[PDB]
Amino acid sequence: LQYGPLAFVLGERTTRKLTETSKVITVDGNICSGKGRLAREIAEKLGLRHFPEAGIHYADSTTGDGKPLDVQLSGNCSLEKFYDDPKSNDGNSYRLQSWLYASRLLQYADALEHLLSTGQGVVLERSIYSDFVFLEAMYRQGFIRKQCVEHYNEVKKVTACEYLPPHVVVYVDVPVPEIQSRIQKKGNPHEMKITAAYLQDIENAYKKTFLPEMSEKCEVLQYSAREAEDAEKVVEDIEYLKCDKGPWPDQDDRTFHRLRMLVQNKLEVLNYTTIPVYLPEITIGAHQSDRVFQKFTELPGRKYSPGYNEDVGDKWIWLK
Amino acid sequence: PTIRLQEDPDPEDENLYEKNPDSHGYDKDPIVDLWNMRVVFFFGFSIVLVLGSTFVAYLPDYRMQEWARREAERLVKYREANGLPLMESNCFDPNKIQLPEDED
Amino acid sequence: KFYIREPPHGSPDWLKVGLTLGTSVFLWIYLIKQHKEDVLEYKRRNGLE
Amino acid sequence: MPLVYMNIIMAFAIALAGLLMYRSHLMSSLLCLEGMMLSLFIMSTLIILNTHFTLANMMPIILLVFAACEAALGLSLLVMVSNTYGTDYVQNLNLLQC
Amino acid sequence: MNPIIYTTLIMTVMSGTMLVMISSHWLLIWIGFEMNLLAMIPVLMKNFNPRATEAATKYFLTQATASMMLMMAIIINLLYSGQWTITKMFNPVAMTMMTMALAMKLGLSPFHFWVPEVTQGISLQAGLLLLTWQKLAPLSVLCQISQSINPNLMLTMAMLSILIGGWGGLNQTQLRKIMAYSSIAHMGWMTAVLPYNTTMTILNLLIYITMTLAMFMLLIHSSATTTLSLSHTWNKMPVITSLMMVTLLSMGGLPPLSGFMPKWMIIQEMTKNESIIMPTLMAMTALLNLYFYMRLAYSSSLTMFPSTNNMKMKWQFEHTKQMKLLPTMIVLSTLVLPMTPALSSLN
Amino acid sequence: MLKIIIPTTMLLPMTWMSKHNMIWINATVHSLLISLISLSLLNQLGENSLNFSLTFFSDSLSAPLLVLTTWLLPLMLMASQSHLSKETTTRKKLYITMLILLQLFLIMTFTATELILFYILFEATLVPTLIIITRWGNQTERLNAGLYFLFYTLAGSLPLLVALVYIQNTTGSLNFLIIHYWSHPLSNSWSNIFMWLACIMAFMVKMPLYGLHLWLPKAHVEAPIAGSMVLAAVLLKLGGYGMMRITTILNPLTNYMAYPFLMLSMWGMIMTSSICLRQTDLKSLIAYSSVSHMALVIVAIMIQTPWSFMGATALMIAHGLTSSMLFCLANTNYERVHSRTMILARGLQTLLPLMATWWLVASLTNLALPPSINLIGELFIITASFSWSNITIILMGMNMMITALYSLYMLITTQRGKYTHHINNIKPSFTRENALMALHILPLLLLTLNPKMILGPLY
Amino acid sequence: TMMSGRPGRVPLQFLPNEARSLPPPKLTDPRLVYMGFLGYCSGLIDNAIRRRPVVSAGLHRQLLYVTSFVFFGYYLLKRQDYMYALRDHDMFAYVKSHPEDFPEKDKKTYGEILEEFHPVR
Ligand SMILES: CCCCCCCCCCCCCCCCCC(=O)OC[C@H](COP(=O)([O-])OCC(O)COP(=O)([O-])OC[C@@H](COC(=O)CCCCCCCCCCCCCCCCC)OC(=O)CCCCCCCCCCCCCCCCC)OC(=O)CCCCCCCCCCCCCCCCC
Ligand SMILES: CCCCCCCCCCCCCCCCC[C@@H](O)O[C@H](CO[C@H](O)CCCCCCCCCCCCCCC)COP(=O)(O)OCC[N+](C)(C)C
Ligand SMILES: CCCCCCCCCCCCCCCCC[C@@H](O)O[C@H](CO[C@H](O)CCCCCCCCCCCCCCC)COP(=O)(O)OCC[N+](C)(C)C
Ligand SMILES: CCCCCCCCCCCCCCCCC[C@@H](O)O[C@H](CO[C@H](O)CCCCCCCCCCCCCCC)COP(=O)(O)OCC[N+](C)(C)C
Ligand SMILES: CCCCCCCC/C=C\CCCCCCCC(=O)O[C@H](COC(=O)CCCCCCC/C=C/CCCCCCCC)COP(=O)(O)OCCN
Ligand SMILES: Nc1ncnc2c1ncn2[C@@H]1O[C@H](COP(=O)(O)OP(=O)(O)O)[C@@H](O)[C@H]1O
């Protein structure tokens, strides 16, 4: 039976599935750090589920089949064009930032839903609470205007206030010159155009605003480049923590019921992302909207409900 | 962005004669266009117009006008021969009408 | 295909289908019987036939 | 009618006006509601006693019970308003307009 | 709020209104009103915020004042006849008290001020409940004592309700305030024909409830509470916009749409007994309601407003919780005009 | 007469169950077949109407209008399948659904035997026309055009409902046969005066009258081609049919009460004919020509003589056909040039000869050339008015002169002269447009061959 | 409300035993057909809202819609006919019971009724 008020009425509660090993874990690191392998190893050792970083086409992997859709139908933005031409006049920068924030919001909703419905913990690679560092980096470098950051702040204020912050935040600290060296050695032709001021603004943002704010609600475990390879040490550090300060031990069954009813129903999660604020970067005209929607509706498995598409081989339609 | 919308450019007119020199101006696909022309012509000019006009031209005289003419001929013949007036002013018999008794 | 279970399965939920079809048939036969009884009572009360 | 009935009705009218005037506070209006109920109770019990209707002697008790329910409701709402604004002033309840 | 507590509060609200509708004693009717208000106050505050708190406060104050006036009317009627049964209510002053108290409970003008504010301050579910279910009990009491009620007082408030509802709805951009002003305008129509024939009142009540239920359920489906927020749903659920446009036309009073049936029947009934001017004024005033419904329809479906980039992500997800009775309410809200003669089953 | 109504309600699901590229063919073919079937109502008894059932009857006045509507739908489908080529399948089906619903309501309107049913369908014709105008228009003024079109009609037709229910409460019935047989004179009182006004003003604003005509230019200019065709051909004749039906109850009040409406109609006919001369737009000129002709029809109905009634019926049919043809002719040029200005594209006779011929024929039939039915109706109305008063001939002759002037002015400006030198996208005329023009114009000549089919019941 | 209070009226019957003396509506009644059509429209709207193939998504659901609408419509029509028959019966009984208020007036022919003539000119 799908979870709802009736499932809550008889039987199913949430606190009887938490086994002290929920521990929503977030790893934050400067561009091109070892946070990915660290998160994977932490998830493997602790037995939690790993959530790879939310990309442009994250929502594509959660619906239909995991195959990503065309950039015109999903995202309408690219990271390569932002690296190559950050000051473009088509508004690609803030469009990309807002789409990535929405994808991170959806991923956080999915992680919370999994944790509440199953009890096994999750290990995210970057949360909605640490997404504003890139926003400040673009704003300080002049990549975006001020109205864009105001719209971002409004959306964040109306969206991120419904969820719970992660139990523990893990930060990987790497100096800017090391980041530049790793970027140069990596090989992708677009990422060597990342200026040093951008990465410096990102890190200034992380230390000054994110970690000081998270230290009031969670536990912060800062590390370094040389101690981010022995994942057994960081796992031992995590499993010897005092989780008594955040709002997580202050949650009753009714609060968990409301949160579980909210994390599912992804439309309710994404409701406030499309507020009627008309910024030139994100506003899309009626004609282009109609054309793109008609194009999306013609996809092989997107015309009807996920069970009523005879195109992708669904049968027994006339009796469902 | 010094603009206000992410708007598609306005498309230019699509000429039906470019990819179809004999278009008939009904559709883009030549076969369905030709058949649309054929059905329009056959059911407008051939069936409805000519057959409908010849059906209307030959409707039976339900308006009772040849009948009215024959009635008039017989009544004129009978009335004139007898010396009676061709037409009578009072449409109804005065005997069957009861006027008010007095007007004072 | 679909990556997720698609709760509407590849076969219909035969329990609900059976319930709906049985409800429809029961309502139809009840309506037929009710109409027959009503017309018989109407014919009896007025003494037509 | 005797003067007692008119005095009770005048008291009810005075309480109703006092409720409808809304000076600054909300406790004042809740007190006006309680006064209206008290006047209704007195009028009802006088009428019932006078006509010797034995059965309706229990009705003013029900009146009092639902008066208490109303008072509890009003007090809870005033508590929440005061927690929101730090003051029970009626001028602060103006977020919604017509 | 716990689901058991919520469902028992809803059942207590329904129990209060049923106690009003099935009781012959005046005291039991007053008790039903009190129970309804007591269990209705927390339902508005299910989603806590300052706006909900002040909406609940205003609603409570208005309903408490109305209950005080109603009980004073009952006591005066008892004073001038030792009778408790809900009947003629011969006494003119007591009848004026009862009529005004029930008008205040209903939202009729000039007591209409509270309705737009409370509707805006509460959620769409609480607004649906308030605008549909909370009209049955006062209307039942009015129908029972309709012969006793004075025509001049009743007519004056109904016409004022229609006028003020139209004029107020002409201005609002928020959907909840539009719905509240439309509710006031419809209350005017229903109480207009009350002294002449209560069957038309019941029929208009049924159709208004159906239309309001359909409109609120469609608004909940496309979770929009403003005009601009509703201007986006053409890019996500065009069928919802088309159905909403048809329902909005029906609400306007246009024929062959069902909404017209209550208006037509009320005009016809009022004409049977030499009331010509009033129906003409009510129709020419309901033109205003039609106008702002039509403006909403222009904003919603008949045109295409610019959308946002993040709607592409909403394109991939389906509405999870589906309303079961929405299609039936839509059909009964639009295509039921040919079944007009079935209104005789209401008397 | 369900043999005509039911095929339309079958046109609906057939349209919705058609293939993506076969909707136009099926709709056109079956609508033409339905019009051929409806051509069978022209057989009318000289004594009384044909009463098929308790709800539907056909008169000599109803049958030409029914045939005109059923013939109109295929032409509207032919004219609409040019600017809708880029539309999706669902919206094309919705457009055809609106057209079919409009035809169904129109068919049920002209044959309803009860006045309240007639009112219900007469007003049900408002929803699809409004949806068409405000959804498939082109400019930003279509919203205001739709609002004007809706509210001018409704604010004048709401009192009609009160008048009708009061009539049924007083006399006891609203069936047209009972109304006509049991009709009684109306005394001279203020109550009866306002009864006259309530019964008349709805159809007056539907004509429209001179003072209440402001909605017509907006609606006819801002609507798409099918909307303009259906507005100017049949939707205007609803008011005339309504007055010709409702006037029986009104006498003897109408003789006394028609002085302001007759005066407005005559002077506004002159005024709108003069307005047509100084028009910079092309569709507005045709709209004002429609206003002038319908004012003439109003005069004919108001003076209320058998010759006036026959002239009114003939003029209604002829104007419907001519105005529809003119609107299509303007729409072809608008599709070529993408503008409505008259003097933009000039000298089109050297580039489109056959369209020049069609323009000439339409303009000739617009200015009442003998022996076309336009002149038959106009001349019968003029003779009836002359019998009414000998001074009306001045106004009628002035109107005829101005009508000829503006018709030939439009024909010369659009067709003669030299081309604009900088419009090089005027492609040769398609077969569809020529076929549409021929299907508009041939019935006019076929009708002037046999004019007794459209002269109404007074024949 | 004229008929709300009537002699010998059971409160919540919805179909008194006296209503069985009237002919039941035929199963092919046009109003029942319209009720079934309303059910079909509701089923189609249900299919459209849930984003399913409108015509052929769920056949059992559409059948249930149609049969429920027809089932309710049968009894609704029965009650409507009963109420109209009851109204006519009461009207005839009242007009018979009070002959002085509904007298039989004289039957004049048009040959002696004088109606004023209004020329059209
Ligand atoms: C009086 C006589 C009868 C007349 C009564 C009235 C008409 C009938 C009753 C009405 C209710 C029935 C159907 C309504 C629900 C359907 C929902 C729908 O959207 O349809 C789409 C659906 C196509 O969807 P699909 O095939 O699944 O794939 C395409 C996707 O859906 C792709 O879809 P999409 O969502 O991507 O497309 C976007 C579109 C989607 O939005 C829509 O499609 C609009 C939905 C219609 C609104 C529903 C209104 C509710 C009913 C009130 C009707 C008012 C009547 C009063 C007159 C005023 C009209 C306003 O939105 C727009 O384009 C926005 C444009 C804005 C235009 C504004 C106009 C909207 C209002 C128009 C209402 C007209 C009346 C309904 C006529 C039928 C329309 C289906 O159409 C159908 O295929 C089913 C239509 C009905 C089938 C009838 C077949 C009957 C049985 C076949 C055999 C016949 C007999 C055989 C036996 C022979 C003996 C051997
Ligand atoms: C392009 C080249 C052009 C030039 C080449 C032309 C070639 C020669 C053609 C010219 C022919 C000359 C015409 C001579 C007249 C002959 C035909 C005429 O005599 O027939 C008339 C017949 O005319 C028809 O009645 C016309 C009927 C009108 C058709 C209706 C239109 C079709 C419906 C389509 C939709 C229209 C919508 C409009 C709503 C009303 C006479 O009617 P009537 O003398 O009495 O009845 C005779 C039969 N009776 C006596 C037994 C009764
Ligand atoms: C833009 C165009 C819109 C449409 C226009 C419609 C026009 C409607 C006007 C109605 C025409 C006549 C109405 C009343 C009939 C007689 C009017 C009057 O001139 O007659 C005199 C009446 O005397 C006075 O004039 C009475 C009328 C004075 C008050 C009415 C107001 C008229 C001023 C103009 C108001 C604007 C009207 C249009 C509103 C937009 C004769 O006196 P008497 O024979 O003893 O009484 C006649 C009536 N009886 C017989 C039933 C008793
Ligand atoms: C506009 C659409 C509205 C539809 C309403 C909902 C339809 C589905 C709901 C199912 C109907 C069942 C409800 C009642 C059935 C059993 C209860 C029965 O005993 O009630 C009795 C009789 O039932 C009801 O009175 C009438 C129910 C019939 C409802 C249909 C009327 C709809 C208006 C006509 C428009 C056509 C609608 C078509 C519907 C699909 C009450 O008699 P009584 O105690 O003496 O009344 C006292 C109060 N009065 C006299 C003042 C009224
Ligand atoms: C595009 C806009 C057009 C607007 C046109 C609107 C004006 C329509 C004309 C008036 C409509 C209302 C008239 C009432 C309908 C008929 C009712 C009737 O016949 O009964 C009359 C009642 O008549 C009235 O009550 C009329 C009252 C009018 C009130 C509203 C007036 C609206 C504006 C007046 C001027 C409009 C007329 C000209 C307008 C021209 C267009 C601008 C007799 O009363 P009884 O009960 O039978 O008693 C008599 C025996 N003792
Ligand atoms: N909010 C954002 N704005 C712009 N770019 C972002 C944002 N979030 C993530 N990215 C991009 O995602 C890329 C991958 O992140 P990173 O962790 O540095 O590489 P890796 O996947 O190897 O760990 C980065 O190049 C970064 O620029």
From TrEMBL, chain A:
Database matches in InterPro entries: Deoxyribonucleoside_kinase (IPR050566), DNK_dom (IPR031314), NDUFA10 (IPR015828), P-loop_NTPase (IPR027417)
One GO CC term, this protein: mitochondrial matrix
Organism ancestry: Eukaryota, Metazoa, Chordata, Craniata, Vertebrata
Subunit structure as annotated in this protein's UniProt entry: Complex I is composed of 45 different subunits. This a component of the hydrophobic protein fraction.
SUPFAM superfamilies, per database record: P-loop containing nucleoside triphosphate hydrolases
Protein name: NADH dehydrogenase [ubiquinone] 1 alpha subcomplex subunit 10, mitochondrial
Localization in the cell: Mitochondrion matrix
Positions that bind GTP 1: C32, S33, G34, K35, G36, Y83, Q97, R104, R126, D131, F134, M138, E191
Binding site for GTP 3: C32, S33, G34, K35, G36, Y83, Q97, R104, R126, D131, F134, E191
Gene that this polypeptide is encoded by: NDUFA10
A Pfam family the protein falls into: dNK
Highest taxon in the source lineage: Eukaryota
List of residues binding Mg(2+) 3: E53
Automatic annotation (TrEMBL), chain C:
Topology term for the membrane: Single-pass membrane protein
Principal subcellular localization: mitochondrion
Keyword ATP-binding on entry: no
Localisation per UniProt entry: Mitochondrion inner membrane
GO CC terms in record: mitochondrial inner membrane; respiratory chain complex I
This protein's UniProt keywords: Electron transport, Membrane, Mitochondrion, Mitochondrion inner membrane, Respiratory chain, Transit peptide, Transmembrane, Transmembrane helix, Transport
Assembly information from the UniProt record: Complex I is composed of 45 different subunits.
Similarity annotation: Belongs to the complex I NDUFC1 subunit family.
Role: Accessory subunit of the mitochondrial membrane respiratory chain NADH dehydrogenase (Complex I), that is believed not to be involved in catalysis. Complex I functions in the transfer of electrons from NADH to the respiratory chain. The immediate electron acceptor for the enzyme is believed to be ubiquinone.
Protein's name in the database: NADH dehydrogenase [ubiquinone] 1 subunit C1, mitochondrial
Organism lineage: Eukaryota, Metazoa, Chordata, Craniata, Vertebrata
Residues of the full protein shown: 28 to 76 of 76
From TrEMBL, chain F:
GO cellular component, as recorded: mitochondrial membrane
Membrane topology per record: Multi-pass membrane protein
Any one GO BP annotation for this protein: ATP synthesis coupled electron transport
Catalytic activity entry: a ubiquinone + NADH + 5 H(+)(in) = a ubiquinol + NAD(+) + 4 H(+)(out)
Record-annotated NADH:quinone oxidoreductase/Mrp antiporter transmembrane domain positions: 112-401
Domain NADH:ubiquinone oxidoreductase chain 4 N-terminal: 1-109
UniProt xrefs under InterPro entries: NADH4_N, NADH_Q_OxRdtase_chainM/4, NADH_UbQ_OxRdtase, ND/Mrp_TM
PANTHER family to which the protein is assigned, alphabetical: NADH-UBIQUINONE OXIDOREDUCTASE CHAIN 4
Name assigned to this protein: NADH-ubiquinone oxidoreductase chain 4
TrEMBL record, chain G:
InterPro entries: NDUC2
One Gene Ontology cellular component annotation held by this UniProt entry: respiratory chain complex I
Family: Belongs to the complex I NDUFC2 subunit family.
Keywords from the UniProt entry: Electron transport, Membrane, Mitochondrion, Mitochondrion inner membrane, Respiratory chain, Transmembrane, Transmembrane helix, Transport, Ubiquinone
Name of the protein: NADH dehydrogenase [ubiquinone] 1 subunit C2
Spans traversing the lipid bilayer: 61-77
Organism: Sus scrofa (Pig)
Bilayer disposition of the protein: Single-pass membrane protein
Biological processes annotated in GO: mitochondrial electron transport, NADH to ubiquinone; mitochondrial respiratory chain complex I assembly
Function: Accessory subunit of the mitochondrial membrane respiratory chain NADH dehydrogenase (Complex I), that is believed not to be involved in catalysis. Complex I functions in the transfer of electrons from NADH to the respiratory chain. The immediate electron acceptor for the enzyme is believed to be ubiquinone.
Pfam families, per database record: NDUF_C2
Location of this chain's protein in the cell: Mitochondrion inner membrane
Top-rank lineage group of the source organism: Eukaryota
Major subcellular site: mitochondrion
